[PDB]
């Protein structure tokens, strides 16, 4: 007779279970969001890395020329000077070959 009792209690439980499944699935939709955020901002960290990878490269490659070029300026001159001294003779040899 009371029917409603067994047919109403049968609803509250069903709609609390409903309510459970969703609030459950949100915690996954919550972590799914964090799953993006943690990737997006990992894309960022690496982007910031590139900077240093191109920048430190800049500063050192810019320095590498300084050190190499000022050794080019130094070593080229020091080979002139090596010749300068012995130079009279070079002609002395070349002149002798053609002469006879």
């Amino acid at each position: 007779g009371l029917i409603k009792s067994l047919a109403e209690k049968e609803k509250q439980l069903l709609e609390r279970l409903e309510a459970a499944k969703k609030e459950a699935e949100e915690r996954v939709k919550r972590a799914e969001a964090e799953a993006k955020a943690l990737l997006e901002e990992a894309e960022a960290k690496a982007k910031a890395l590139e900077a240093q990878y191109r920048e430190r490269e800049r500063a050192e490659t810019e320095a590498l020329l300084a050190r190499y070029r000022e050794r080019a300026e130094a070593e080229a001159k020091a080979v002139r000077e090596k010749a300068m001294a012995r130079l009279d003779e070079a002609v002395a040899l070349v002149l002798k070959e053609v002469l006879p």
């Binding site: 439980l13 799953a35 490269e57 490659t61 080979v79 070079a90």
Partner: protein, 185 residues
């Protein structure tokens, strides 16, 4: 009603298992990322590290090419000077008190290479000097090409000569080797 009390605790106890299912299924998502990001950024550190050393190799390889040129640049400034002095030396010979002596040296030397021989050539810079073996031998001194001596033989034939500057381009080009060692020994 104790009967439905048990239906409550049971259904409610099912709720407690759904939420826990979610939590672990979330924690694995959270941890899926933690690794996912770690595994890419490691991979993008790698690629950049090569984008560094291999870049620096081509920079270091550049500097050596600038030093190598630099040096070769310097040796040319020198080697050309030695060239000028040999030329200057050959060009200051005429006004030196030793030039007429050399004259018939190359005049005779060529005269041997042409056994037949009709006549010979030379400038007033030189030709006048040719009186020594102008009296002797053929006696033909007529022509003008001012550093060197030529000859014409077999009546006409192939008229073979001997330019003083043609001796340089040969002899310089040959022992340019003994000279470079002598310089940078």
């Amino acid at each position: 009603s104790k009967l439905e009390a048990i239906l409550s605790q049971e259904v409610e106890a099912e709720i407690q298992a759904l939420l826990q299912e979610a939590e672990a299924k979330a924690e694995a998502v959270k941890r899926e990322a933690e690794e996912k990001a770690k595994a890419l950024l490691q991979a993008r550190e790698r690629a950049l590290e090569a984008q560094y050393r291999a870049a620096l190799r081509r920079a270091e390889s550049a500097g050596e090419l600038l030093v190598a040129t630099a040096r070769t640049q310097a040796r040319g400034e020198v080697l050309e000077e030695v060239r000028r002095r040999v030329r200057e030396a050959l060009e200051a010979l005429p006004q030196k008190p030793e030039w007429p002596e050399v004259v018939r040296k190359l005049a005779l030397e060529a005269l041997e290479a042409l056994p037949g021989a009709k006549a010979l050539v030379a400038n007033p810079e030189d030709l006048p000097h040719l009186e020594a073996m102008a009296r002797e031998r053929g006696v033909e001194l007529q022509a003008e090409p001012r550093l060197g001596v030529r000859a014409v033989g077999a009546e006409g034939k192939t008229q073979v000569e001997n330019s003083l500057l043609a001796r340089m381009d040969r002899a310089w080009d040959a022992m340019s080797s003994k000279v470079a060692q002598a310089l940078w020994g």
